[PDB]
Design a protein around this ligand. Structure first.
Ligand SMILES: *c1c(F)c(=O)[nH]c(=O)n1[C@@H]1O[C@H](COP(=O)(O)O)[C@@H](O)[C@H]1O
Ligand SMILES: *c1c(F)c(=O)[nH]c(=O)n1[C@@H]1O[C@H](COP(=O)(O)O)[C@@H](O)[C@H]1O
Lengths: 214, 214
């Protein structure tokens, strides 16, 4: 992705979301759109962003239902124009496979969320996360999400998924993660609030790239 | 809830969803709306259903993000008129607390999803599910979801949450669960496909109630 930086666009107003994304477009390739924006403005926002900015769109829906419903969610999300969807691994292999089947049907991609970045991830997810990553490898998943806030865990996750796999990482900035130490292991960093709440989002994005280019 | 039966309305077309829900309205109190319908027709569908049928609406969004984003998702969902939201416990106590805080602000309810009903739930969720339920009790959660497909697990979950707590249960019918054996432990059963894919959804709903009334 351009400059190894993915914008987490979690503003809830279409005008603010369009403004900030336009301001930082020269620094990014890829916009991650989640439920804060979609549940506020509708699924049409995906196609609008894709068209207006010409950026790849990852739908960060952290899909975590039964196989049947996961299929439905993925179908609707790809129909809306998303290039990829983020799905949780914790619900197990059948739920993940359902997403992979739809992505196959529609020539799109699945990212498997292994360990989450927030403190509560330590309670239950962390203990399962290595296994979740191996399950991904066993299912042929090539794209993964893991936590900027725990680079030792990123390292381990990278070890499991191999060098070929594509690994993106949230928790940079607001949650305490560092761009440099995350990119030792991840291919790309996800950044939301440090950019979209900044007085000058372009300056914030540019500053992050300036720490990446080194 | 009326007749202890909650309709899982996962059709993806507004007209079909309205038709089936209208047909079974005399048998239900409560409609569960999830992402299959919302991602197809928009969040406005919640207020439409609530108004047109005068039914309580549970938004089954299986919320599974970090605290900050969970707050945003819950806010948008209650703003759209939902009475309650289903959230995953697996991401940990902070993520659950975030949802409880918004439900407090807005005089609404959270249901904590403990163990899921599908086969893949055995991989990771089942091993954490008793703890997830205890975490709920420790946070003051009063409403829970657990699996019709494993009544021995329902029993254990009921044991942890106590008799006061309200427990609803999916996996009846299509997934193999039985109305009678689920209602030994759950207060209400969730039923989707057995009703909404039936040639006569009212007859299917009525048949389920006829097995409940006994
Ligand atoms: C999702 C997830 F599964 C994580 O483990 N961590 C995480 O933060 N998210 C989502 O990533 C973005 C982080 O944005 P920022 O903290 O930079 O504002 C958000 O979209 C969050 O939902
Ligand atoms: C969600 C969940 F967390 C479960 O453990 N099981 C489950 O099935 N769901 C959702 O409940 C409904 C079941 O409907 P049915 O199988 O009767 O068609 C669906 O909305 C499913 O997403």
């Amino acid at each position: 992705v351009m400059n190894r930086l993915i914008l987490a666009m979690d503003l809830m107003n279409r005008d603010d979301a369009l403004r900030v994304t336009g301001e930082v477009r020269e620094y990014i390739d890829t916009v991650k759109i989640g439920y804060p924006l979609v549940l506020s403005e509708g699924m049409d926002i995906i196609a609008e962003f894709r068209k207006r900015f010409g950026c790849r769109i990852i739908a960060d829906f952290k899909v975590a239902d039964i196989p049947e419903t996961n299929e439905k969610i993925c179908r609707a999300t790809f129909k809306a124009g998303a290039d990829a969807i983020i799905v949780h691994g914790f619900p197990g292999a059948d739920s993940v496979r359902a997403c992979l089947n739809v992505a196959e049907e529609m020539g799109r991609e699945v990212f498997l969320l292994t360990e989450m970045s927030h403190p509560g991830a330590e309670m239950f997810i962390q203990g399962a996360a290595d296994e979740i990553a191996r399950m991904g490898v066993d299912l042929g998943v090539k794209n993964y999400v893991g936590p900027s806030t725990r680079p030792e865990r990123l390292s381990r996750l990278r070890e499991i998924i191999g060098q070929d796999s594509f690994l993106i990482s949230p928790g940079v900035g607001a949650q305490g993660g560092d761009p440099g130490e995350t990119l030792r292991f991840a291919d790309a960093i996800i950044v939301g609030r440090s950019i979209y709440l900044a007085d000058n989002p372009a300056a914030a994005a540019a500053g992050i790239i300036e720490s990446i280019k080194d």
